[PDB]
Curated annotation (Swiss-Prot), chain A:
It comes from Autographa californica nuclear polyhedrosis virus (AcMNPV). The keyword S-adenosyl-L-methionine does not apply. Interacts with host mus209/PCNA, cdc2 and cdk6. Forms a complex with proteins C42 and p78/83. This is Occlusion-derived virus envelope protein E27. Coiled coil: none annotated. Belongs to the baculoviridae E27 family. Keywords: Host-virus interaction, Membrane, Modulation of host cell cycle by viral cyclin-like protein, Modulation of host cell cycle by virus, Viral envelope protein, Virion. InterPro entries: Baculo_ODV-E27. The keyword Ubl conjugation does not apply. Pfam families: Baculo_ODV-E27 (PF05314).
Curated annotation (Swiss-Prot), chain B:
The chain holds residues 114 to 335 of 361 of the full protein. This is Protein C42. Forms a complex with proteins E27 and p78/83. The interaction with p78/83 mediates nuclear translocation of P78/83. Interacts with protein Ac102. Interacts with IE0. GO terms for cellular component: host cell nucleus; virion component. Belongs to the baculoviridae C42 protein family. Keywords: Host nucleus, Late protein, Virion. Plays a role in host nuclear actin polymerization by recruiting p78/73 protein that is capable of activating an actin-related protein 2/3 complex to initiate nuclear actin polymerization. Its main location: host cell. It is found in: Host nucleus; Virion.
Length: 223, 222, 220, 186
């Protein structure tokens, strides 16, 4: 809370106004490196907390390995998706539709990039996943970083990395839900349309991609 | 004859060409030479050494190993990576071999020629296309019922004690940040192009270029 | 090695090696297998293998002694002669040194890396609410001056004594009877707004009295 | 009053200079676009020459050579100092924040042949000129006073404050900034 006064060549008094302290600290904190780091870390903490609540989530990579039980895989998927739903908006906390889910075991299903595949017919919404490649994706995570509860950074790495692709899938599901098969297919031909469609999305909260760049050499972008 | 040092370089080279090559500037022609010398010394691995030296634009009469010999070769491979948790398909190794063929066919000098490409050497004499992905299709998915659904651990859980979770957070604070991404996210989901192992439909920089124009919106619209 | 077709590989390796000679440069061409083959061959040829293991000094900062008997040095140079035609320009320590330099200039970590994405860091703020603009100047260090400056308009030099009535007087007709005072007020408002914002962005904070002094212009 | 008359007179002559040799921009403010190079310097240089010759009419032609850098980054940013100039080795080099200028010049503003003019946009000229005045202060300081006190004043602006050069007037009375007064409230 502040005020301001000004005067002129003439004796004709002055102009006055007030200005509000809050905004300035607000903005400096909005640029306060530590603040944003805390935000992202808090998000990850929330997710891992939900994992702990989820039947005390067991060791990740082997739990995904071994073809032991589809049940835990499906539960992981569902819970992560609901978590993303809630983060992007707690306003509509969940979604009813029950369904089974597909695991597939063969390269012959390979979809480049996309590991996870939404589908529907006859009102039965469904999604499908090729474990093997994802297992490979998780496995071997040197994470060199060269340059009491056993909570190592290592598996936390995978715990984060999953979230990225799951978010990527959440985009496609949202698109299909709003617009159905035609837009969904036309989009999953090419992700490039996403922003041009979602320009409306002044959502209250922000995506993970804070680091603001993911680029490599210009060469070979040939006409 | 520092067989030890030579091996030590070699293993790094193996990982660098195979998978999860988090390293940087691993390449060194002297080091790969030490690798070849180590191979020669490795009488037990002479099979692989001769296979590797064979890399030239001829390659008629490939090794044609019996499956037993291939299995012993994979045993060597795992014993020499000393990270045996998986046996990779031979085809990845042959692809690294094709990369080595590129290395041979290279009068390339002080110029900083980063390879800057995914090698196209996975082919099986087939052609592939993006709309043809729709023809790869989920007919198989239609041929499979999803395994199951059940209500157990049912419905909508929520978060635990903030204070306990801060207790846990304190273990996370020490760790570095964004290097985790630069390792895992970068490497892994770049190399996901491996999926083109299915008759190598070409990669397309274009949609990967989504990333900047899509993430920018956060800052662009506050 | 049985496999290595010793005679052929020897011939090729010799042709490569000649490029250290001033006359020969491998026609500015090579295939890295050509280089690879030579070390192998030398390992297979004991007369050379000694010299080769010694020439590990070529790339290695620490490989072993230079000092060998005169006879031993001849034991090397003669092998060199045998490898080469030895038509003239008799093998000598000068040739040895030239060879070593040539390898130094050949093996220089030529690249073979392929791909890896790149990130950046885009937050100014570090933990100091106290920061003076002064120490922020110490930060800036005029480091920007490392960056190339850009030519001015290059008009030469002028003072536009633009006396006018054709436009001027019609402009004067728009006397513009407005609260010049309150426009000044707005101007000052926005100007301190600019500086206040930029301070906040830097996390610097300052004595307002200094700004008061800055403004305090008029007297008499 | 006669004071208002002369004030608007000086305003009009500022419009006359704005009737610049080139004045080629379709814009009011090229700064709206990242692309320009020359017109920025044109405007700046011209305004500086104008100010100096107003301060005294005793200059023939304004020194010609100069060089410039655009600045558009928080790294470049210097709060309080949007514009900077030094005749290092007698050679003028200078720098100006495109975004920092624009983002606040464009700010929301109070509102209480046709050949017609609009107050706020005119006032943009005034405000920018004020920034130039602030710069010129330190410029003319260093022009006759050494690096030590120069650099000091760049923070202790008060240093030149409450010290005359010739007199408290020193022809400052003939400068428009003299006519203004301000205080931050409690």
């Amino acid at each position: 809370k502040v005020r301001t006064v000004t005067e002129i060549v003439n004796s004709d008094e002055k102009i006055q106004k007030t200005y509000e302290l809050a905004e300035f600290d607000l903005k400096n904190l909005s640029s306060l490196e530590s603040y944003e780091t805390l935000k992202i870390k808090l998000a990850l903490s929330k997710y891992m907390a939900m994992l702990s609540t989820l039947e005390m989530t067991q060791p990740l990579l082997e739990i995904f390995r071994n073809k032991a039980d589809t049940r835990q895989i499906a539960a992981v998927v569902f819970s992560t998706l609901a978590f993303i739903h809630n983060r992007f908006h707690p306003l509509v906390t969940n979604f009813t539709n029950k369904m089974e889910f597909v695991v597939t075991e063969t390269n012959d299903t390979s979809i480049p990039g996309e590991p996870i595949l939404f589908t529907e017919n006859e009102g039965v919404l469904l999604c499908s996943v090729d474990r093997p490649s994802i297992v490979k994706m998780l496995s071997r995570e040197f994470d060199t970083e060269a340059l009491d509860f056993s909570i190592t950074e290592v598996e936390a790495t995978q715990y984060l990395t999953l979230l990225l692709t799951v978010e990527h899938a959440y985009l496609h599901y949202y698109i299909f839900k709003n617009y159905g098969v035609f837009e969904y297919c036309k989009s999953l031909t090419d992700h490039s349309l996403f922003t041009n469609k979602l320009r409306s999305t002044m959502s209250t909260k922000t995506s993970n991609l804070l680091l603001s760049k993911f680029k490599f050499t210009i060469e070979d972008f040939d006409k | 004859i520092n067989m030890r040092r030579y091996r030590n370089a070699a293993r790094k080279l193996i990982h660098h060409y195979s998978l999860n090559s988090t390293s940087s500037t691993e390449y060194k022609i002297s080091d790969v030479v030490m690798t070849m010398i180590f191979l020669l010394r490795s009488e037990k691995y002479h099979s692989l050494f001769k296979l590797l030296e064979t890399t030239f634009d001829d390659y008629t009469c490939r090794p044609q190993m019996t499956q037993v010999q291939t299995d012993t070769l994979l045993d060597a491979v795992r014993s020499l990576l000393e990270m045996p948790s998986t046996t990779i398909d031979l085809t990845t190794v042959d692809i690294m071999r094709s990369s080595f063929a590129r290395c041979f066919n290279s009068p390339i000098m002080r110029y900083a020629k980063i390879v800057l490409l995914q090698n196209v050497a996975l082919q099986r004499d087939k052609r592939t296309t993006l709309e043809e992905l729709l023809i790869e299709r989920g007919e198989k998915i239609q041929m499979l019922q999803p395994q199951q659904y059940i209500n157990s651990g049912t419905e909508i859980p929520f978060c635990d004690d903030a204070e306990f979770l801060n207790r846990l957070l304190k273990h996370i604070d020490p760790y570095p940040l964004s290097r985790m991404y630069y390792n895992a996210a970068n490497t892994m989901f770049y190399t996901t192009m491996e999926n083109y192992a299915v008759s190598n439909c070409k990669f397309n920089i274009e949609d990967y270029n989504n990333i900047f124009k899509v993430m920018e919106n956060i800052r662009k619209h506050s």
